[PDB]
């Protein structure tokens, strides 16, 4: 597709998604949350034990593994919060209403949260935090620990960049016609935002709660194996999650996805 | 293919499989079991001697080598037990009966068992357990050993995750139109389920019997080469396999493949 | 496409680019600068801590990661300065005048500058320079310092090489028709020009200003962690950048991209 | 292509191959042997100097490099002996006679042997055995040495496994319609058989004669370079090759390729 | 395309190239030489500092990097010498005369030499030999030194093997129709001949003269950094290059390209 055609199909997807039946949107958001949880589990598995490997190569491979979740979302038509920020193109064109925008945003947000929590529960019940002699759980705990130590502006900017990359991956997916065209065009754009450590709202909704669960309910054998204590991650709290991470990263995701990609492309190809 | 057409072709495949001749289904189940045995053998060869490599990269490469088996099943049209769980989509639409589904499931399960046992016999007769100064047999023994030390809930959840990933790979291949559309879209979902160590019934009924026979009839030279004894794998018995692994993993596979993918997508795209 | 058709579509791209509204070209140039800076951030991330890695393999991996930005430029229709030097094919045939080409070049250059500066600001606000205990900022500073120690002749020749490779990658994408035709054919040409350390104007006007910003506004904790001082990069000034690097590299880019690819292929396939 | 269409085109290819001109078949078999020797040369080049590297990664990369030769035979239409076992499908359908099967098999075998010997001569005259301070010749000698130490049952089973993998690589390439569809789908099945040490007749009639030639005619400088002696490979003999390796591996290839792939698919898709 | 259609399109390409205007052939030969020197610069950059990396993996990755030059030659239609040997198919069918083939070969040879020399000048004026602190120039010198120490028969056989691989890569690209089929089908055949150290005339035309330039005109700081002296490269002379390298390598290239690929396939698919 030509870029004007990509803008047109983006507008069509925006009007199509916002007018869907709300319960169908809720189930699709649940599946999208499960897909992002799957992608982050793959990222954690790939980066387990890579303390001796080069930092950049390990981050790049982990980001490549994380690209599976967005591929699943696009191919299966799941409703992902960061991917549905592009339906603001339809709002800017006047083809959907502000109320529809807000309702779809809230519905997809809640659905991704529910799916992420359900996959967190299923992930905990599988005993995966003890694989690699507990290095899996320690990897999750270290990932969730550094994600709550950022400032407000810093976290907002990381979210802006993360959803900018995600929305650029989704827009480049509109150009392709075949399955490989859509899938392979999102590998590098997603590996870019994951390897750089940009903050993703739905990914954080799986990582930080899973770290909290591991910290709260870890067996003594896990702490003996990893050589750590729960006192080392005392900042892994739900309130700290919402304050330090969730709100600024979600705001940054909204700003990035809406203003930087969708609105600029609507201005350039669709305002006239 | 769009997700609605994807659900439609999934319903078509579910109807087609249940209505095939029993002998054709049995033969294709045998071939699917052989394909999964081939994939896990490729995985074992790919993970030989990686005690020094990072855990994540080794598991990811081994999982990528495992994608060959599901690609073989999809391209050659063989009935894998986890893939035939997706005939529940046709069952939920009323196009097939409960008895047909049960007969097809039992036939495919028996065929998978026969194929896995035949490939176990072929692998034993080929002398492959002595590869890499016996490290191939060592890898087989340790892979089979940790598969029988999971609790019932843990094994059920691991099977749920494994068959969820496998059925997501199979469902996404419905979107593909050409050969490499189907092939390359399935590398990541299977590499994930292998790298994360999720328990798959069909791969288990190959490797756990493989490790059992290796432990039972290994030559003394192998034991001197590996620096081990049959005593350290004393729990690798057939009854231990059936109780600790086979039943919970099969139950988890059924639950995941049916409810999480098949019935969810039937509800979303085929309920009305 | 055959080479004659490739030259014809290059001609059409040259006239079509030179006839957009000036604001549209400015916006597309800004997005092109943002994409190239995304690619360069990916290059820094993928090559952080690769001091123990072989020089060539780390450079190649970073260059492959850098290919994301130019793929974004070609797929999304962004206006890159080194890619718009190919519109000289349209000028050589007389379908556009010298004034249109000069105005288009100035507009694209200024838009690229604005985009690179905005992305520099965004990456500074995110705190990315402290990644890997300051190794990310250290890699940024090392890359920026090495690029200002080239004399005029070597800088001009390196720009010639860089834009020759960029314009060859752009030219090869004209042959392809699908998205993966255009995507994969430009991975190796960009990876080779990044790995070999050729001087790209648009990449540099994001790289060096970011190094200047890091030098000026880094916290003393960063310097303590990296074991260096801001005095060790005293040559990273704006005027030194503009004189020793920007001007010769831009001149070399223009010469390479225009003469070596554009006018040469116009002579071969369009002069008769 | 669906599996029924794949079986149909397999039948058509089997009928076409058996009825071609004997001289054209001989020349195609010569080119196929040359292609297989090229693949094994690439394999040895890739796997030289990897004593310190993990067994799994080294074998997998060597197998990926081996994929080139099979793609050469498939795309160029060369007659590979293992691939021409699949023309037994035509025999089972009665569309060709037993004598046609025997004549085609003998012609392709002789042509493959002639091509392998010609490439052995060309590789010996090129002085490639001294690459990397003699590590190339040492790799050839060591890999050839271990291939003649297998018992008859081991050789038969290894040939069965190898040619099964090769014939499944060929069979799924029937599904593909594009050149790269046939190419990439065959990389994993060939890499699986190479990495797992499975025994291929055509590859062996190149390697073992190459090892014999290297042992017999190497200069003493090569021997001092490798730190070994020709006495260390006393079992690399022509008679030992023919007895312990060629006959059983060929028997295993015939049995596997005929019964397990061709006849199985004929039973499933062609008997009715 | 089928092998018969591939031979037909090879004949068409041979007829078309021989009947082009001499100046167009000269310009395309210059661009082809530039492309091949681009490939060799990529190969040198990728393999810089891989003295600790295994020999096989380093050579294979370098061959992956070298495949860029052939992609440029096939996609952009440039006249590269070993590729233009395949016009012997047209001569064998009688569609072109001996004189046309002779002038075409001479023109392509001279243009390739001119392009390689101009690009040697471009890289020497860029200071690339100082990359990686003298390791880039040292790598070029080491690559150039080993190529001029091969015997006449060894050089002829290396050229034969190299040109066989190039003509198989080109002849395999005829089947592919879009850009990505042609591009990807050539990476492995080129990586095979580059990793194995086979001798390519046009590649040597850039390699050895570049090493001569580095030896003659390098600053003494280069010699102190690399810890070597120009006395260690006394055999790197222009006359030495032409005698020991250029003539036998070109003879082997012609023999390979003519007899092995072009004439054999003409006999198989076009004589009768």
JSON list of C-alpha atoms in Angstrom, two decimals, chain C residues 36-219:
[
{"chain": "C", "resi": 36, "resn": "UNK", "atom": "CA", "xyz": [16.82, 7.86, 11.35]},
{"chain": "C", "resi": 37, "resn": "UNK", "atom": "CA", "xyz": [17.32, 8.86, 14.99]},
{"chain": "C", "resi": 38, "resn": "UNK", "atom": "CA", "xyz": [15.25, 5.84, 16.06]},
{"chain": "C", "resi": 39, "resn": "UNK", "atom": "CA", "xyz": [17.62, 3.70, 13.98]},
{"chain": "C", "resi": 40, "resn": "UNK", "atom": "CA", "xyz": [20.68, 5.33, 15.53]},
{"chain": "C", "resi": 41, "resn": "UNK", "atom": "CA", "xyz": [19.33, 4.83, 19.07]},
{"chain": "C", "resi": 42, "resn": "UNK", "atom": "CA", "xyz": [18.81, 1.18, 18.15]},
{"chain": "C", "resi": 43, "resn": "UNK", "atom": "CA", "xyz": [22.41, 1.10, 16.91]},
{"chain": "C", "resi": 44, "resn": "UNK", "atom": "CA", "xyz": [23.69, 2.47, 20.22]},
{"chain": "C", "resi": 45, "resn": "UNK", "atom": "CA", "xyz": [21.53, 0.06, 22.23]},
{"chain": "C", "resi": 46, "resn": "UNK", "atom": "CA", "xyz": [22.59, -3.00, 20.23]},
{"chain": "C", "resi": 47, "resn": "UNK", "atom": "CA", "xyz": [26.28, -2.08, 20.52]},
{"chain": "C", "resi": 48, "resn": "UNK", "atom": "CA", "xyz": [26.43, -1.16, 24.23]},
{"chain": "C", "resi": 49, "resn": "UNK", "atom": "CA", "xyz": [28.93, -3.31, 26.11]},
{"chain": "C", "resi": 50, "resn": "UNK", "atom": "CA", "xyz": [30.30, -4.98, 22.96]},
{"chain": "C", "resi": 51, "resn": "UNK", "atom": "CA", "xyz": [33.88, -4.15, 23.91]},
{"chain": "C", "resi": 52, "resn": "UNK", "atom": "CA", "xyz": [34.51, -7.84, 24.54]},
{"chain": "C", "resi": 53, "resn": "UNK", "atom": "CA", "xyz": [32.76, -8.70, 21.24]},
{"chain": "C", "resi": 54, "resn": "UNK", "atom": "CA", "xyz": [34.66, -8.83, 17.94]},
{"chain": "C", "resi": 55, "resn": "UNK", "atom": "CA", "xyz": [34.71, -5.41, 16.28]},
{"chain": "C", "resi": 56, "resn": "UNK", "atom": "CA", "xyz": [33.27, -6.58, 12.97]},
{"chain": "C", "resi": 57, "resn": "UNK", "atom": "CA", "xyz": [30.44, -8.69, 14.38]},
{"chain": "C", "resi": 58, "resn": "UNK", "atom": "CA", "xyz": [29.33, -5.96, 16.79]},
{"chain": "C", "resi": 59, "resn": "UNK", "atom": "CA", "xyz": [29.45, -3.39, 13.98]},
{"chain": "C", "resi": 60, "resn": "UNK", "atom": "CA", "xyz": [27.44, -5.69, 11.70]},
{"chain": "C", "resi": 61, "resn": "UNK", "atom": "CA", "xyz": [24.79, -6.33, 14.35]},
{"chain": "C", "resi": 62, "resn": "UNK", "atom": "CA", "xyz": [24.48, -2.61, 15.08]},
{"chain": "C", "resi": 63, "resn": "UNK", "atom": "CA", "xyz": [24.20, -1.87, 11.36]},
{"chain": "C", "resi": 64, "resn": "UNK", "atom": "CA", "xyz": [21.47, -4.48, 10.92]},
{"chain": "C", "resi": 65, "resn": "UNK", "atom": "CA", "xyz": [19.61, -2.83, 13.79]},
{"chain": "C", "resi": 66, "resn": "UNK", "atom": "CA", "xyz": [20.21, 0.55, 12.11]},
{"chain": "C", "resi": 67, "resn": "UNK", "atom": "CA", "xyz": [18.36, -0.67, 8.99]},
{"chain": "C", "resi": 68, "resn": "UNK", "atom": "CA", "xyz": [15.05, -0.08, 10.81]},
{"chain": "C", "resi": 69, "resn": "UNK", "atom": "CA", "xyz": [15.13, 3.68, 10.27]},
{"chain": "C", "resi": 70, "resn": "UNK", "atom": "CA", "xyz": [15.57, 3.65, 6.50]},
{"chain": "C", "resi": 71, "resn": "UNK", "atom": "CA", "xyz": [12.98, 0.89, 6.09]},
{"chain": "C", "resi": 72, "resn": "UNK", "atom": "CA", "xyz": [10.67, 3.22, 8.03]},
{"chain": "C", "resi": 73, "resn": "UNK", "atom": "CA", "xyz": [11.60, 6.04, 5.64]},
{"chain": "C", "resi": 74, "resn": "UNK", "atom": "CA", "xyz": [10.85, 4.09, 2.45]},
{"chain": "C", "resi": 75, "resn": "UNK", "atom": "CA", "xyz": [7.71, 2.30, 3.68]},
{"chain": "C", "resi": 76, "resn": "UNK", "atom": "CA", "xyz": [6.14, 5.36, 5.32]},
{"chain": "C", "resi": 77, "resn": "UNK", "atom": "CA", "xyz": [7.09, 7.75, 2.50]},
{"chain": "C", "resi": 78, "resn": "UNK", "atom": "CA", "xyz": [9.29, 9.97, 4.66]},
{"chain": "C", "resi": 79, "resn": "UNK", "atom": "CA", "xyz": [11.61, 12.51, 3.02]},
{"chain": "C", "resi": 80, "resn": "UNK", "atom": "CA", "xyz": [15.24, 11.74, 3.87]},
{"chain": "C", "resi": 81, "resn": "UNK", "atom": "CA", "xyz": [17.85, 14.22, 2.64]},
{"chain": "C", "resi": 82, "resn": "UNK", "atom": "CA", "xyz": [20.28, 11.60, 1.35]},
{"chain": "C", "resi": 83, "resn": "UNK", "atom": "CA", "xyz": [17.40, 9.75, -0.31]},
{"chain": "C", "resi": 84, "resn": "UNK", "atom": "CA", "xyz": [16.07, 12.91, -2.00]},
{"chain": "C", "resi": 85, "resn": "UNK", "atom": "CA", "xyz": [19.38, 13.54, -3.78]},
{"chain": "C", "resi": 86, "resn": "UNK", "atom": "CA", "xyz": [18.07, 10.97, -6.29]},
{"chain": "C", "resi": 87, "resn": "UNK", "atom": "CA", "xyz": [15.51, 13.52, -7.57]},
{"chain": "C", "resi": 88, "resn": "UNK", "atom": "CA", "xyz": [18.44, 14.80, -9.64]},
{"chain": "C", "resi": 89, "resn": "UNK", "atom": "CA", "xyz": [17.35, 12.08, -12.07]},
{"chain": "C", "resi": 90, "resn": "UNK", "atom": "CA", "xyz": [14.21, 14.13, -12.73]},
{"chain": "C", "resi": 91, "resn": "UNK", "atom": "CA", "xyz": [16.30, 17.30, -13.03]},
{"chain": "C", "resi": 92, "resn": "UNK", "atom": "CA", "xyz": [18.69, 15.60, -15.47]},
{"chain": "C", "resi": 93, "resn": "UNK", "atom": "CA", "xyz": [15.76, 14.80, -17.77]},
{"chain": "C", "resi": 94, "resn": "UNK", "atom": "CA", "xyz": [14.37, 18.34, -17.54]},
{"chain": "C", "resi": 95, "resn": "UNK", "atom": "CA", "xyz": [11.07, 17.41, -15.89]},
{"chain": "C", "resi": 96, "resn": "UNK", "atom": "CA", "xyz": [11.93, 19.75, -12.99]},
{"chain": "C", "resi": 97, "resn": "UNK", "atom": "CA", "xyz": [14.01, 22.92, -12.77]},
{"chain": "C", "resi": 98, "resn": "UNK", "atom": "CA", "xyz": [17.04, 23.76, -10.65]},
{"chain": "C", "resi": 99, "resn": "UNK", "atom": "CA", "xyz": [15.05, 26.01, -8.32]},
{"chain": "C", "resi": 100, "resn": "UNK", "atom": "CA", "xyz": [12.55, 23.29, -7.44]},
{"chain": "C", "resi": 101, "resn": "UNK", "atom": "CA", "xyz": [15.39, 20.87, -6.64]},
{"chain": "C", "resi": 102, "resn": "UNK", "atom": "CA", "xyz": [17.19, 23.46, -4.49]},
{"chain": "C", "resi": 103, "resn": "UNK", "atom": "CA", "xyz": [14.02, 24.36, -2.57]},
{"chain": "C", "resi": 104, "resn": "UNK", "atom": "CA", "xyz": [13.20, 20.68, -2.02]},
{"chain": "C", "resi": 105, "resn": "UNK", "atom": "CA", "xyz": [16.73, 19.95, -0.78]},
{"chain": "C", "resi": 106, "resn": "UNK", "atom": "CA", "xyz": [16.65, 22.89, 1.63]},
{"chain": "C", "resi": 107, "resn": "UNK", "atom": "CA", "xyz": [13.21, 21.91, 2.94]},
{"chain": "C", "resi": 108, "resn": "UNK", "atom": "CA", "xyz": [14.17, 18.27, 3.47]},
{"chain": "C", "resi": 109, "resn": "UNK", "atom": "CA", "xyz": [17.47, 19.22, 5.14]},
{"chain": "C", "resi": 110, "resn": "UNK", "atom": "CA", "xyz": [15.77, 21.63, 7.55]},
{"chain": "C", "resi": 111, "resn": "UNK", "atom": "CA", "xyz": [13.02, 19.13, 8.37]},
{"chain": "C", "resi": 112, "resn": "UNK", "atom": "CA", "xyz": [15.62, 16.45, 9.07]},
{"chain": "C", "resi": 113, "resn": "UNK", "atom": "CA", "xyz": [17.44, 18.89, 11.35]},
{"chain": "C", "resi": 114, "resn": "UNK", "atom": "CA", "xyz": [14.25, 19.68, 13.27]},
{"chain": "C", "resi": 115, "resn": "UNK", "atom": "CA", "xyz": [13.40, 16.00, 13.65]},
{"chain": "C", "resi": 116, "resn": "UNK", "atom": "CA", "xyz": [16.89, 15.07, 14.83]},
{"chain": "C", "resi": 117, "resn": "UNK", "atom": "CA", "xyz": [16.95, 17.88, 17.40]},
{"chain": "C", "resi": 118, "resn": "UNK", "atom": "CA", "xyz": [13.50, 16.94, 18.71]},
{"chain": "C", "resi": 119, "resn": "UNK", "atom": "CA", "xyz": [14.51, 13.29, 19.05]},
{"chain": "C", "resi": 120, "resn": "UNK", "atom": "CA", "xyz": [17.72, 14.36, 20.82]},
{"chain": "C", "resi": 121, "resn": "UNK", "atom": "CA", "xyz": [15.59, 16.27, 23.32]},
{"chain": "C", "resi": 122, "resn": "UNK", "atom": "CA", "xyz": [13.22, 13.33, 23.76]},
{"chain": "C", "resi": 123, "resn": "UNK", "atom": "CA", "xyz": [16.05, 10.85, 24.38]},
{"chain": "C", "resi": 124, "resn": "UNK", "atom": "CA", "xyz": [17.69, 13.23, 26.84]},
{"chain": "C", "resi": 125, "resn": "UNK", "atom": "CA", "xyz": [14.45, 13.61, 28.81]},
{"chain": "C", "resi": 126, "resn": "UNK", "atom": "CA", "xyz": [14.07, 9.82, 29.05]},
{"chain": "C", "resi": 127, "resn": "UNK", "atom": "CA", "xyz": [17.33, 9.28, 30.93]},
{"chain": "C", "resi": 128, "resn": "UNK", "atom": "CA", "xyz": [18.55, 6.75, 28.36]},
{"chain": "C", "resi": 129, "resn": "UNK", "atom": "CA", "xyz": [22.19, 7.83, 28.81]},
{"chain": "C", "resi": 130, "resn": "UNK", "atom": "CA", "xyz": [22.40, 6.04, 32.18]},
{"chain": "C", "resi": 131, "resn": "UNK", "atom": "CA", "xyz": [21.47, 2.63, 30.72]},
{"chain": "C", "resi": 132, "resn": "UNK", "atom": "CA", "xyz": [23.88, -0.21, 31.57]},
{"chain": "C", "resi": 133, "resn": "UNK", "atom": "CA", "xyz": [25.43, 1.82, 34.42]},
{"chain": "C", "resi": 134, "resn": "UNK", "atom": "CA", "xyz": [26.24, 4.66, 32.04]},
{"chain": "C", "resi": 135, "resn": "UNK", "atom": "CA", "xyz": [27.65, 2.45, 29.28]},
{"chain": "C", "resi": 136, "resn": "UNK", "atom": "CA", "xyz": [24.94, 3.72, 26.92]},
{"chain": "C", "resi": 137, "resn": "UNK", "atom": "CA", "xyz": [26.03, 7.33, 27.35]},
{"chain": "C", "resi": 138, "resn": "UNK", "atom": "CA", "xyz": [29.67, 6.23, 27.17]},
{"chain": "C", "resi": 139, "resn": "UNK", "atom": "CA", "xyz": [29.00, 4.52, 23.83]},
{"chain": "C", "resi": 140, "resn": "UNK", "atom": "CA", "xyz": [27.22, 7.67, 22.63]},
{"chain": "C", "resi": 141, "resn": "UNK", "atom": "CA", "xyz": [30.20, 9.81, 23.63]},
{"chain": "C", "resi": 142, "resn": "UNK", "atom": "CA", "xyz": [32.70, 7.43, 22.02]},
{"chain": "C", "resi": 143, "resn": "UNK", "atom": "CA", "xyz": [30.72, 7.39, 18.77]},
{"chain": "C", "resi": 144, "resn": "UNK", "atom": "CA", "xyz": [30.41, 11.19, 18.75]},
{"chain": "C", "resi": 145, "resn": "UNK", "atom": "CA", "xyz": [34.09, 11.79, 19.55]},
{"chain": "C", "resi": 146, "resn": "UNK", "atom": "CA", "xyz": [35.35, 9.49, 16.78]},
{"chain": "C", "resi": 147, "resn": "UNK", "atom": "CA", "xyz": [33.27, 11.29, 14.13]},
{"chain": "C", "resi": 148, "resn": "UNK", "atom": "CA", "xyz": [34.81, 14.76, 14.69]},
{"chain": "C", "resi": 149, "resn": "UNK", "atom": "CA", "xyz": [38.44, 13.65, 14.24]},
{"chain": "C", "resi": 150, "resn": "UNK", "atom": "CA", "xyz": [38.18, 13.14, 10.47]},
{"chain": "C", "resi": 151, "resn": "UNK", "atom": "CA", "xyz": [39.75, 15.69, 8.15]},
{"chain": "C", "resi": 152, "resn": "UNK", "atom": "CA", "xyz": [37.93, 17.25, 5.20]},
{"chain": "C", "resi": 153, "resn": "UNK", "atom": "CA", "xyz": [39.02, 14.76, 2.53]},
{"chain": "C", "resi": 154, "resn": "UNK", "atom": "CA", "xyz": [38.27, 11.60, 4.52]},
{"chain": "C", "resi": 155, "resn": "UNK", "atom": "CA", "xyz": [34.95, 13.05, 5.70]},
{"chain": "C", "resi": 156, "resn": "UNK", "atom": "CA", "xyz": [33.95, 13.86, 2.11]},
{"chain": "C", "resi": 157, "resn": "UNK", "atom": "CA", "xyz": [34.91, 10.37, 0.92]},
{"chain": "C", "resi": 158, "resn": "UNK", "atom": "CA", "xyz": [33.07, 8.72, 3.82]},
{"chain": "C", "resi": 159, "resn": "UNK", "atom": "CA", "xyz": [29.96, 10.74, 3.01]},
{"chain": "C", "resi": 160, "resn": "UNK", "atom": "CA", "xyz": [30.30, 9.69, -0.63]},
{"chain": "C", "resi": 161, "resn": "UNK", "atom": "CA", "xyz": [30.41, 6.06, 0.49]},
{"chain": "C", "resi": 162, "resn": "UNK", "atom": "CA", "xyz": [27.51, 6.44, 2.93]},
{"chain": "C", "resi": 163, "resn": "UNK", "atom": "CA", "xyz": [25.11, 8.07, 0.49]},
{"chain": "C", "resi": 164, "resn": "UNK", "atom": "CA", "xyz": [26.23, 5.74, -2.31]},
{"chain": "C", "resi": 165, "resn": "UNK", "atom": "CA", "xyz": [25.12, 2.80, -0.17]},
{"chain": "C", "resi": 166, "resn": "UNK", "atom": "CA", "xyz": [21.93, 4.57, 0.94]},
{"chain": "C", "resi": 167, "resn": "UNK", "atom": "CA", "xyz": [20.95, 5.45, -2.63]},
{"chain": "C", "resi": 168, "resn": "UNK", "atom": "CA", "xyz": [21.80, 1.92, -3.79]},
{"chain": "C", "resi": 169, "resn": "UNK", "atom": "CA", "xyz": [19.51, 0.50, -1.09]},
{"chain": "C", "resi": 170, "resn": "UNK", "atom": "CA", "xyz": [16.77, 2.93, -2.13]},
{"chain": "C", "resi": 171, "resn": "UNK", "atom": "CA", "xyz": [17.29, 2.06, -5.81]},
{"chain": "C", "resi": 172, "resn": "UNK", "atom": "CA", "xyz": [17.07, -1.68, -5.11]},
{"chain": "C", "resi": 173, "resn": "UNK", "atom": "CA", "xyz": [13.74, -1.28, -3.30]},
{"chain": "C", "resi": 174, "resn": "UNK", "atom": "CA", "xyz": [12.27, 0.06, -6.55]},
{"chain": "C", "resi": 175, "resn": "UNK", "atom": "CA", "xyz": [12.69, -3.41, -8.04]},
{"chain": "C", "resi": 176, "resn": "UNK", "atom": "CA", "xyz": [10.58, -5.06, -5.35]},
{"chain": "C", "resi": 177, "resn": "UNK", "atom": "CA", "xyz": [6.79, -4.96, -5.23]},
{"chain": "C", "resi": 178, "resn": "UNK", "atom": "CA", "xyz": [5.71, -6.40, -1.86]},
{"chain": "C", "resi": 179, "resn": "UNK", "atom": "CA", "xyz": [6.54, -5.06, 1.59]},
{"chain": "C", "resi": 180, "resn": "UNK", "atom": "CA", "xyz": [9.16, -7.72, 2.30]},
{"chain": "C", "resi": 181, "resn": "UNK", "atom": "CA", "xyz": [10.65, -7.05, -1.13]},
{"chain": "C", "resi": 182, "resn": "UNK", "atom": "CA", "xyz": [11.38, -3.49, -0.03]},
{"chain": "C", "resi": 183, "resn": "UNK", "atom": "CA", "xyz": [12.20, -4.40, 3.57]},
{"chain": "C", "resi": 184, "resn": "UNK", "atom": "CA", "xyz": [14.84, -7.13, 3.26]},
{"chain": "C", "resi": 185, "resn": "UNK", "atom": "CA", "xyz": [16.67, -5.70, 0.23]},
{"chain": "C", "resi": 186, "resn": "UNK", "atom": "CA", "xyz": [17.73, -2.64, 2.25]},
{"chain": "C", "resi": 187, "resn": "UNK", "atom": "CA", "xyz": [19.04, -4.45, 5.34]},
{"chain": "C", "resi": 188, "resn": "UNK", "atom": "CA", "xyz": [22.49, -5.45, 4.07]},
{"chain": "C", "resi": 189, "resn": "UNK", "atom": "CA", "xyz": [23.28, -2.16, 2.21]},
{"chain": "C", "resi": 190, "resn": "UNK", "atom": "CA", "xyz": [22.56, -0.13, 5.36]},
{"chain": "C", "resi": 191, "resn": "UNK", "atom": "CA", "xyz": [24.30, -2.62, 7.64]},
{"chain": "C", "resi": 192, "resn": "UNK", "atom": "CA", "xyz": [27.45, -2.43, 5.52]},
{"chain": "C", "resi": 193, "resn": "UNK", "atom": "CA", "xyz": [27.56, 1.38, 5.53]},
{"chain": "C", "resi": 194, "resn": "UNK", "atom": "CA", "xyz": [26.98, 1.51, 9.29]},
{"chain": "C", "resi": 195, "resn": "UNK", "atom": "CA", "xyz": [29.46, -1.28, 10.07]},
{"chain": "C", "resi": 196, "resn": "UNK", "atom": "CA", "xyz": [32.22, 0.33, 7.99]},
{"chain": "C", "resi": 197, "resn": "UNK", "atom": "CA", "xyz": [31.76, 3.65, 9.79]},
{"chain": "C", "resi": 198, "resn": "UNK", "atom": "CA", "xyz": [30.73, 5.79, 6.84]},
{"chain": "C", "resi": 199, "resn": "UNK", "atom": "CA", "xyz": [29.57, 9.31, 7.63]},
{"chain": "C", "resi": 200, "resn": "UNK", "atom": "CA", "xyz": [25.84, 9.88, 7.10]},
{"chain": "C", "resi": 201, "resn": "UNK", "atom": "CA", "xyz": [24.71, 13.49, 7.48]},
{"chain": "C", "resi": 202, "resn": "UNK", "atom": "CA", "xyz": [21.28, 12.85, 8.99]},
{"chain": "C", "resi": 203, "resn": "UNK", "atom": "CA", "xyz": [22.62, 10.18, 11.34]},
{"chain": "C", "resi": 204, "resn": "UNK", "atom": "CA", "xyz": [25.40, 12.54, 12.46]},
{"chain": "C", "resi": 205, "resn": "UNK", "atom": "CA", "xyz": [23.15, 15.53, 13.15]},
{"chain": "C", "resi": 206, "resn": "UNK", "atom": "CA", "xyz": [21.40, 13.33, 15.72]},
{"chain": "C", "resi": 207, "resn": "UNK", "atom": "CA", "xyz": [24.57, 11.59, 16.93]},
{"chain": "C", "resi": 208, "resn": "UNK", "atom": "CA", "xyz": [26.98, 14.45, 17.63]},
{"chain": "C", "resi": 209, "resn": "UNK", "atom": "CA", "xyz": [24.44, 16.92, 19.12]},
{"chain": "C", "resi": 210, "resn": "UNK", "atom": "CA", "xyz": [23.34, 14.15, 21.48]},
{"chain": "C", "resi": 211, "resn": "UNK", "atom": "CA", "xyz": [26.96, 13.68, 22.53]},
{"chain": "C", "resi": 212, "resn": "UNK", "atom": "CA", "xyz": [27.25, 17.43, 23.12]},
{"chain": "C", "resi": 213, "resn": "UNK", "atom": "CA", "xyz": [24.08, 17.38, 25.24]},
{"chain": "C", "resi": 214, "resn": "UNK", "atom": "CA", "xyz": [25.37, 14.41, 27.25]},
{"chain": "C", "resi": 215, "resn": "UNK", "atom": "CA", "xyz": [28.73, 16.12, 27.81]},
{"chain": "C", "resi": 216, "resn": "UNK", "atom": "CA", "xyz": [27.11, 19.38, 28.89]},
{"chain": "C", "resi": 217, "resn": "UNK", "atom": "CA", "xyz": [24.34, 18.03, 31.12]},
{"chain": "C", "resi": 218, "resn": "UNK", "atom": "CA", "xyz": [25.49, 14.65, 32.44]},
{"chain": "C", "resi": 219, "resn": "UNK", "atom": "CA", "xyz": [25.23, 14.11, 36.18]}
]
